[PDB]
């Protein structure tokens, strides 16, 4: 009795005042959640939720019990008490409770069902009977429990559970249906695939139940069902195979019914779209999918400016998206997503069938839709469309002058989108059509929105246009954009500025002659609307970099004085930082005196802490609404992380990094500070990988700055050690790669013997944990379903090992022995194989490997003739390196294989020109090691593999060997080719050979060579 009113007072104190409520909070956490009181507390809260006549106490207790029962956890609760808790929870559930309390009871009950927990067959019985209750809330609540605890589905007899769900799908109550569908999908969510076939057979009942929602006009409930179905498509797309046409046709039917509210229609579209992302082969094998998908997104794209045919409201607004045009926005993203998954082969035809027709409609909305659809699809359909580019402009460009301004904006949109998506080929070949088209829209004759969008599209075009292509168009581009600069509308001016900036960036030195007109107009705008000023300083400094320092000097001082005023006076802050940074690229070392102005603010931003809020289950989701926040669950609990702030930290770190890169020795004074207060702490930012990576790349660059100008040695020890330590903790494979790369770059900077023996040992463990977890993730990649990330990581591990070998000067062989099992497993899935071979090549570089000759040559010799070029490459290099560093413990292999090599050689094609060049070098190595001991055809074979133009270290050997007939023209050319291709003293050898021939015989060899390479030849000989 006592315990009860203590606890009762506490929980009642929760609703309320700080004092009474804080006393209760402490009491709960410090006194009641302890080994000694936990079961009393859980017992209490279960009893309150079950029996309390007060709504709020009941609700709260149910929630608290749920939370605390995890943490306990339920497993360490005494059997007698579990049972009592179970029985009261259950009695409460079966009693008369408000809906939301039964929900919370259900959630509490779920915490009491567990693999290790004793069977609770009274629950099973309660659920079965509740499912048949005439009270919807009982039925709904039971499916909810089967959602939280899908294992219970396995526990019921299969012939009971099946009709339970079938009744569920078909229930009179919407709520019950939604919960049945939720429970049904939850099963697949939670259980192994080997359990899936047991409920999979229910899919047709579910699909067949769906037309009922449209009959009754229950579209909100439809949307929820569509959301469950979307999750099921991501889990088991192939389950939908047999009834694919029916679900396609159904989503079609919903979307077209445009008396329905948006949610049913947007979720139906999503359902359709998501098949392309999870079962592409399925979509592609069915012409109906593509046709339906195109047709419905085209319908939805026309849903703009409704009830406003003149677009007055659109004409009058800024250049942002109208948040009321939801289905339009959805349609665009969907077409884009499917095009990107399926390609043009499959969608262009159906797409264009419709566009040809919509371009000609008298309804403007359809002519617009056409342009926006093309815009959405062009990237994904590039494989086909990139070739039919005159045809596309023939459709679009006529519309640039449509009576309706929104159709015009639409056409500008396409010219913009494709300038990006088909770049750089479109800039080269359609400039003569695209630029005049966009330039004509800049005139003040057109509407603000159109002038702006045409100027936006000129950013897309410019980004990939060489200065020479833009040159004849600059005066025209510029005179027009100046007028836009004089607009009354802020967004027109802001666009004008950005377009000029980016045109100047592309124009480079060709912009020098426009600088005197622009620069004063820009200075005037600044001396006077935050974004205007920012875009204005951005325009100024991009012009500055375009024209170079000398020209920039006519206004740099004044510009700098304005920036100072601006900086010390929120989107502006970021334009300011970029501008200062760009001035540092212009001014070079002359920036040094400005570091004390510019660096302090960067230090503040780059010192941002991992802004975490240890957060509550409910209190998430709505925290998630904000683009600037995310929530995850890491080790059970919920964490709110301020994402934007951490993006900004990265951006600042990238600027510090770029100052350090440009200023070299002159940045040294900041190295210790940035290293200890920014780079290093950033590795411990487990919630944001950008930070971790940005911290990593900063390290070698900081070291290199201090080098150029004891401390250095300390910092490197600290930095390398945290890098190394990151290898055994870092969860994200892409980051792990950055660390290895970062070590490589560190080692390269620091030089000889930069690592200590313990570090070398700690590295090895990290290398092993990395290899182990890569193996484990990869041995995971079906009945129900249709990774360079991994390849890239292994690529870099190769580099770090190599780098470590080199700094240790061999000594790392010792440590390298511990991961030989690991290496060996890899050697005998192509990516792991390539890796292994690459490692072995490095090993030999430092005849102490005999211990393993027998363990690998069997696989290497196999690999030589592999269908895979990357394997042959790595293999041959190994055999060649054998004859170089281990001449004698390897002969029985090298000379036999030698015929294999003459065959692998025979190939000379971009994709494998690299592999055959290694083999070529590999045979020249064998010919060297065992020079007059060979059974000589060989050398004349080898020669016919010249020239070597791609692999540099290979080329380096071959021409060294060449430097030790009427082959004379092929001798020379073999060299000119290597030089000219910049792949590789053999010159000295050659001049002597040309000595052995007349005036006229000598000259004639170069007779084939064009002017430009004869310039080089003169400067080589």
């Amino acid at each position: 009795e006592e315990v009860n009113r203590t606890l009762l007072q506490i929980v009642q104190a929760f609703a309320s005042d700080n004092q009474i409520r804080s006393v209760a909070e402490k009491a709960l956490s410090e006194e009641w959640i302890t080994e000694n009181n936990i079961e009393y507390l859980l017992t209490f809260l279960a009893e309150q939720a079950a029996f309390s006549q007060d709504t709020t106490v009941a609700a709260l207790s149910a929630v608290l019990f749920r939370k605390l029962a995890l943490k306990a956890p339920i497993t360490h609760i005494r059997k007698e008490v579990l049972a009592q808790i179970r029985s009261s929870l259950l009695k409460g559930f079966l009693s008369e409770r408000a809906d939301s309390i039964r929900h919370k009871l259900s959630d509490a009950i779920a915490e009491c069902v567990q693999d290790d927990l004793p069977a609770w067959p009274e629950l099973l019985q309660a659920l079965i009977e509740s499912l048949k209750s005439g009270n919807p809330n009982f039925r709904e609540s039971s499916f909810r429990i089967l959602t939280t605890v899908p294992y219970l589905i396995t526990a019921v007899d299969i012939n009971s559970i099946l009709p339970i769900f079938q009744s569920g799908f078909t229930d009179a109550s919407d709520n019950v249906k939604i919960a049945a569908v939720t429970a049904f999908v939850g099963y697949f969510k939670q259980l192994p695939k080997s359990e899936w076939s047991k409920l999979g057979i229910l899919l047709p009942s579910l699909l067949n139940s769906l037309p009922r929602f449209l009959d009754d006009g229950k579209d909100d409930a439809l949307a929820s069902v569509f959301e469950s179905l979307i999750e099921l498509v991501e889990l088991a797309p192939k389950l939908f195979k047999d009834m694919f046409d029916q679900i396609i046709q159904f989503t079609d039917m919903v979307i077209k019914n445009k008396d329905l509210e948006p949610p049913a229609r947007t979720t139906a579209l999503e359902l359709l779209t998501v098949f392309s992302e999870n079962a592409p082969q399925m979509c592609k094998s069915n012409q109906n999918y593509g046709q339906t998908l195109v047709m419905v997104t085209l319908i939805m794209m026309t849903e703009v400016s409704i009830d406003d045919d003149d677009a007055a409201e659109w004409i009058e607004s800024d250049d942002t998206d109208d948040e009321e045009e939801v289905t339009y926005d959805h349609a665009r993203q969907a077409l884009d997503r499917v095009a990107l998954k399926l390609g043009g082969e499959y969608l262009a035809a159906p797409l264009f069938q419709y566009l040809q027709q919509m371009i000609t409609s008298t309804e403007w909305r359809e002519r617009f839709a056409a342009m926006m659809a093309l815009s959405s699809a062009a990237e994904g359909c590039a494989d086909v469309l990139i070739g039919e580019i005159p045809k596309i402009l023939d459709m679009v460009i006529p519309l640039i002058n449509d009576p309706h301004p929104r159709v015009q904006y639409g056409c500008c949109n396409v010219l913009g989108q494709i300038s990006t998506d088909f770049s750089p080929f479109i800039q080269r070949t359609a400039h003569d059509r695209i630029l005049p088209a966009l330039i004509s829209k800049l005139t003040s004759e057109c509407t603000s929105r159109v002038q702006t969008h045409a100027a936006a599209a000129l950013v897309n075009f410019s980004e990939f246009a060489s200065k020479d292509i833009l040159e004849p168009y600059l005066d025209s581009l510029l005179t027009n954009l100046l007028v836009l600069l004089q607009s009354n509308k802020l967004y027109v001016q802001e666009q004008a500025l950005t377009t000029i900036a980016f045109i100047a960036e592309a124009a480079k030195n060709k912009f020098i002659k426009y600088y005197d007109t622009l620069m004063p107009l820009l200075l005037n705008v600044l001396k006077v609307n935050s974004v205007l000023k920012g875009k204005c300083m951005e325009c100024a400094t991009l012009i500055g970099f375009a024209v170079g320092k000398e020209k920039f000097h006519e206004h740099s001082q004044e510009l700098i004085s304005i920036l100072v005023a601006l900086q010390n006076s929120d989107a502006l802050r970021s334009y300011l930082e970029q501008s200062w940074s760009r001035i540092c690229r212009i001014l070079g070392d002359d920036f040094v005196p400005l570091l004390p102005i510019v660096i302090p603010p960067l230090l503040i931003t780059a010192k941002a802490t991992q802004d975490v809020g240890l957060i509550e289950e409910e209190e998430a989701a709505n925290f998630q609404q904000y683009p600037d926040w995310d929530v995850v669950q890491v080790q059970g609990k919920h964490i709110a992380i301020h994402t934007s702030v951490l993006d900004d930290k990265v951006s600042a770190m990238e600027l510090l990094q770029s100052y350090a890169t440009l200023l070299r020795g002159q940045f040294a004074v900041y190295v210790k500070e940035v290293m200890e207060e920014i780079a290093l702490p950033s590795l411990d930012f487990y919630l944001h990988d950008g930070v971790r990576a940005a911290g990593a790349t900063l390290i070698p660059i900081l070291l290199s700055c201090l080098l150029a100008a004891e401390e250095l040695v300390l910092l490197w020890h600290k930095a390398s050690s945290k890098l190394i330590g990151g290898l055994m903790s870092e969860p994200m494979p892409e980051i792990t790669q950055v660390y290895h790369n970062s070590l490589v770059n560190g080692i390269k900077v620091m030089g000889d013997n930069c690592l200590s023996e313990d570090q070398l040992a700690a590295f090895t463990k990290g290398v092993s944990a990395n290899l182990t977890d890569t193996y484990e993730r990869m041995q995971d990649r079906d009945e129900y379903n249709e990774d360079f990330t991994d390849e890239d990581l292994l690529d870099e591990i190769n580099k770090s090992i190599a780098a470590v070998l080199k700094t240790t000067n061999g000594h790392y062989l010792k440590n390298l022995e511990n991961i030989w099992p690991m290496i060996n497993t890899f050697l005998l899935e192509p990516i792991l194989v390539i890796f292994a071979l690459v490692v072995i090549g490095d090993l030999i570089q430092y005849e102490q490997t005999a211990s393993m000759k027998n363990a690998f040559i069997p696989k290497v010799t196999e690999c030589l003739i592999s269908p895979d070029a990357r394997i042959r490459q790595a293999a041959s290099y190994i055999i060649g390196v054998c004859a170089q560093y281990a001449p004698s413990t390897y002969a029985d292999v090298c000379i036999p294989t030698l015929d294999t090599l003459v065959q692998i050689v025979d190939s000379k094609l971009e994709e494998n020109r690299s592999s055959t060049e290694n083999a070529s070098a590999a045979i020249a190595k064998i010919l060297y090691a065992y020079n007059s001991n060979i059974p000589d055809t060989y050398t004349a074979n080898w020669f016919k593999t010249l020239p070597t133009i791609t692999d540099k270290e290979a080329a380096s050997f071959n021409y060294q060997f060449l430097s030790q007939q009427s082959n004379i023209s092929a001798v020379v050319d073999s060299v000119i080719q290597a030089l000219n291709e910049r792949s590789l003293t053999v010159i000295s050898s050659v001049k002597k050979l040309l000595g052995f021939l007349p005036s006229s015989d000598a000259m004639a060899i170069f007779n084939r060579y064009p002017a430009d390479i004869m310039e080089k030849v003169h400067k080589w000989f």
């Binding site: 936006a456 950013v459 980004e463 666009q495």
Partner: peptide, 10 residues
């Protein structure tokens, strides 16, 4: 803001 692009809520 301030090129021609397509947005993304996937």
């Amino acid at each position: 803001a301030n090129k021609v692009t397509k947005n993304k809520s996937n």
